Symmetry: D2
C-alpha cells in the first residue's frame, strides 16, 4: 500500500519476504511451515522479543519506495543496516518539488526556493553539468529511494524515529511505516508495541528505587492483577529483584 | 527446492524476495514494475554488475534452510553480511549424525565414544550445554541463512574457488545452482564478469601493454562478441 | 594486559584506539583534543549513552587476543559487528589443548579427548589432509583468534554475554573483557553499568503496574534520595507517569 | 596530519590503530609483535591482499576529521562500513561557508539570500532543525569518519576512479596520501593489485588466450621482476 506523508512525500510497500509465520518458522529451524497455533506462535514470538533472541526477526524483510526531503533522507540514511538506492542528482535532472511546512516551529522560504531553483535552471542552460548544478538547491528538495530492511532493524528504526526526540518530519515517516508493519506482521508488532515502543528502560538507580519502595510479593500481585503469569511474571520480578 | 549435500546434509530454499526484475526495478527506483524488454533489462543488469553499482543487487534476497557439519558452518559463518539462526546445542538435544566422508582428501570409533559419553553425561544429568562439549567437529548441525544477492555472489565467488575447502565448496555449488535458476539475468552477468573472470595486477597489464596493441586487442575482443561500452571499457583497462 | 580465563584460556588487550576523551571528542567534532573537564565530559558521556547517541562510542576501538574453547568461540562469533582472524584448522596442527571444566553443571571427558586426539595424529600420520583430520576433535578444543570491535558494539556484546541467561563459560570471558574495558574507559563503563548492564527494560504492563502501586511525589523522593535530580529525574518520572 | 581540500575543506588524521605490522601480527594471531623482516612482511602483505584474505587488513583503523560540502558528504555516506558523527543542524548554528568552485564544468547571491533567510528565520524564533532547510547542498559540513583499512581501501578504489565525482575524488586523493604514508607496505600492495590493476571478464581472458602463449606471456612478466607464486598466478588466469 501507499501512504502520503508531508505535503508531497509518501511511503509505499514495494515487496515483503515473510510474515509472523516466518519468524516462528526460522526460530524452529523447520523443514516445513514451522507453524503451530496462533496463541502458541504469538507466545513464541512474544518470548523472542522479550529475551532479545533477534535472529528470527531478521528472517522477515520489507522494501519501501520513499519520497522525502533531503534533510529527512540524511537522518534516515544514518541507519547503516539497510540497503538503499536513491535517485542520483548526477545523472537525472531534479524535479522542482520542495517540502513546505504546515507551519514553522519555535526554538521567505518560498523565495529562496525560487531563487535557488532559478539558479539551478540558469546554470543548466549554460551547459553546467548536472552533478554540479544541483548544489545550489536547498535541503528541503524532495528525493526518492528504495529502502530495504529486515524486521529486527526496522523495529530499531521505528523505536528511534518514533521517539519524540526525532525530528517531526521523520517521525511522520516512521508513523507511516509503523502502520504498514502493524498490518503485515501483527503478532510481531504486538510484541514490539508491548515490550519496546510502549516500554521504557530504567537505569540502575531507578531499579534501586523500585527496591526499598516495593517488595517482591507486592509487585507480583500488582502485575498478575494486570494479567501477567508464569515466565512473564517471574521475569518481570527478576528484572527488579533477581 | 531441497538439494542434498554430503552424506546427511542439504541446502533448501525457504523463501525469496525479488528476481532479475527487482534489480532493474530498484535501479530505476520505479513506481511500478520498473521493467522493459528482457534485452534492455539484461543489458542494465550487466552494466550495474560491471560498474559496481551494487545497491540494486541488494534488493534481492534469498533465505535457505541448511544442514551441514559444524566444521563447515564455522567457515560459512565467517561471512558476516547475513542473518542466521541455528539449532542451539544449549536448548535442544543433538541427533546422532556425523559427516562420514566418502573419501579422505576409526572415525566411527571416536563418534561412538564421543556420542557415548554424550548420553552418559546426559544420563548422569549434566547440563546439556556442557554435554555436547564432547561431540566431534564433524557432528551435523542445522540453520537458516538469509542473505542478499550481492553478498551471496561474494559468498559464491569465495566458496566456489578451488582454495575453499571441498565440503564448503559443494554447499556453494548447491547454492549456486539454485541462484542461477531464480535470477538468470543476474547469474549470467556474475558468471561472465566475476566468477569465471579474473583480476590483473598492474605489472600484468604493463605486460599486456607491451605484447599486444590497441588495434590487435580490439579485433580479438569484438570477434569474440564484445561490442558497445563493454568494448571501450575493456580496451581502457589496458590502454 | 592479560587475564586468564577457564583452565587454559585468556584475554589480552593487543591495542586500543581512543579512550573516554575520544568519545567526547567525536561528539564535538573537534580540530583539537576535544576534551573539556572530567566532570563536563563524564556528563556528556552519560548523556550520549542514556539517549542512545551511539556514534561517539564507535570512535573507540579495542583489539584482543583470545584463547577459548571452540564451542565458546561459536557463541562469540554470533556477534557479526567485529573483525576476527582465527588460526586455521586447515593449515596448522591444533595443539592438544582441551577445556576440562572446573565442575560439571546440573541441568570420561579425559577419555574422549585422549582418543579423539590420537585419531587426529593417526590421520595426520596416515597422510590425511589437515583440513579433514581436525574434524574428529571435540568442541571443547581450545582455539585462538584476534577480535576487534568498537566500544558501542562491545558494550552490546557484554550486555548479552554477562547476563545469567548466557552460558557460564562465555560469561567468564565477558567478565575478563569487562575488567579490561572498565580500566581503560572508566567514564564510558560507569555510564554503561548505570544505564544498561545494571539497568533493565520494562514492558507496558510492567510500567502500568508501577504506576498505580506508586505515586509521582513518592517515586520522586526515592529517586531524588539516591541522587536523581534534573533531566534524569524528569525522565525517570515520565517513564512511569506520562 | 592536515590536508586542505577544495577552497575551504580539509582532511585530518585524528588517530590511527595499527600499521603494516598489525596486519601481519593479526594474520599471525601473534602473542607479541608478530613481525619479521620488512621484506617478508611486505611479501606476506602482498599475498593476503592478492588472495583476498581480508580479515588482517581490518585490524588497522583510521579516524579522520573531515570538512566538505554537504553534497560531498552524501556520497561519502553511501559507504556503510564506517562510523560517522557529523555536526548536527538540529543543535548548533551552521557557519556561513560554501564551496565556491574555482571553475564550473550568481552562486553568491543565492547563498547570501539563503543564509540571510536562514539567519532571518533563526531571529524570528524558528527552530534550528527547520531553519537550516533553506541552505544549499554546497554548504560546508563537518564530521569524524572511522573506517578500517580493508573498507577504507574499497572506498579509495571507488572514489579515486574517473567515474567518481570530481569533488569527492579530491577528498579520496587526500586520504590516499595519508594512507600511503602511514601503511606504506599495505599501500604498495593496494596500488599494485587493486588501484592500478583491472578486472577482466571471461571473454576478455578468452581474447587473451590463444592470442598469446604461456611462454610469450612469462617472457614479458619475468622481464618485470614478476616470478614465483605471482608469476604462476598471472599465467593461470589466462591458461591454468
Ligand atoms: C538523541 C539523538 C541525537 C543524535 N545526534 C547526532 C549528532 O549530533 N550527529 C550525528 O552524526 N548523529 C547523531 N545521531 C544519530 C546516531 O549517532 C546514529 O547514527 C543513528 O541513531 C543510527 O543508530 P544506529 O547506527 O544504531 O542504527 P543502524 O545504523 O541501522 O545500525 C544499527 C546497529 O547495527 C550495528 N552496526 C551497523 N553498521 C555498523 C558499522 N558500520 N560499524 C559498527 N557497527 C555497525 C550497530 O551496533 C548499530 O547500533 C543522534 C541520535 C539520537 C537518537
Ligand atoms: C586464502 C584465504 C585465507 C583465509 N585465512 C583465514 C584465517 O587464517 N583466519 C580467519 O579467521 N579467516 C580467514 N579467511 C577468511 C577471510 O578473512 C574472511 O573472513 C572471509 O573470506 C569473509 O569474507 P568477507 O568478510 O569480505 O565477507 P563478509 O563477512 O559477508 O563481509 C563482506 C564485506 O562487508 C564488510 N563488513 C562486514 N562486516 C564488517 C565489520 N564487522 N566491520 C567492518 N566491515 C565489515 C567488509 O568490507 C567485508 O569485506 C581466509 C580467506 C581466504 C580467501
Ligand atoms: C536468549 C537468547 C537466545 C538465543 N538463541 C539463539 C538460537 O537458538 N540460535 C541462534 O543462532 N542464535 C541465538 N541467539 C543469538 C542471537 O540470535 C544473535 O545472533 C546474537 O545475540 C547477536 O545479537 P546481535 O546480532 O544483535 O549482535 P551483532 O551480531 O554484533 O549485531 C549487532 C546489531 O547490528 C546489526 N547487524 C549486525 N550484523 C547484521 C547483519 N548481518 N544483518 C543485519 N543486521 C546486522 C543488528 O541490528 C544487530 O542487532 C540467542 C540470543 C539470546 C539472547
Ligand atoms: C558507478 C556507480 C554508480 C552508482 N549509482 C548510484 C545511484 O544511482 N543511487 C545510489 O543510491 N547509489 C549509487 N551508487 C552507490 C553504490 O550502489 C554503493 O552504495 C556505494 O558505492 C557503496 O559501495 P558499498 O556498499 O560496497 O560500500 P559499503 O557501504 O562500505 O559496504 C561495503 C560492503 O560491506 C557489505 N555491507 C555493508 N553494509 C551492508 C548492509 N547494510 N547490508 C548488507 N551488506 C552490507 C557489502 O558486501 C558491501 O559491498 C553508485 C556507485 C557506483 C560505483
Amino acid at each position: 500500500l501507499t501512504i502520503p506523508v508531508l505535503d508531497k512525500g509518501f511511503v509505499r510497500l514495494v515487496d515483503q519476504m515473510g510474515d509472523d509465520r516466518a519468524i516462528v518458522q526460522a526460530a524452529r529451524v523447520s523443514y516445513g511451515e514451522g507453524t503451530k497455533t496462533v496463541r502458541e506462535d504469538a507466545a513464541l514470538i512474544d518470548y523472542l522479543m522479550r529475551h532479545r533472541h533477534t535472529s528470527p526477526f531478521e528472517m522477515v524483510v520489507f522494501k519501501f519506495h520513499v519520497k522525502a526531503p533531503i534533510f529527512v533522507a540524511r537522518q534516515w540514511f544514518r541507519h547503516r543496516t539497510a540497503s538503499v538506492n536513491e535517485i542520483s542528482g548526477r545523472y537525472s535532472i531534479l524535479k522542482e518539488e520542495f517540502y513546505e511546512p504546515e507551519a514553522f516551529r519555535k526554538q521567505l522560504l518560498r523565495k529562496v526556493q525560487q531563487e535557488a531553483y532559478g539558479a539551478y535552471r540558469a546554470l543548466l542552460e549554460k551547459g553546467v553539468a548536472r552533478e554540479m548544478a544541483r548544489m545550489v538547491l536547498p535541503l528541503n528538495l524532495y528525493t526518492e529511494f528504495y529502502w530495504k530492511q529486515d524486521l529486527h532493524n526496522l523495529f530499531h528504526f521505528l523505536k528511534l524515529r518514533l521517539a519524540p526526540e526525532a525530528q517531526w518530519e521523520i517521525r511522520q515517516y516512521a508513523r507511516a511505516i509503523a502502520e504498514i508493519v502493524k498490518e503485515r506482521v501483527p503478532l510481531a508488532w504486538a510484541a514490539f508495541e508491548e515490550h519496546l515502543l510502549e516500554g521504557a528502560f530504567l537505569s540502575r538507580t531507578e531499579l534501586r528505587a523500585l527496591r526499598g519502595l516495593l517488595t517482591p510479593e507486592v509487585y507480583e500481585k500488582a502485575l498478575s492483577s494486570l494479567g501477567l503469569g508464569g515466565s512473564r511474571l517471574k521475569e518481570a520480578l527478576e528484572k527488579v529483584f533477581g
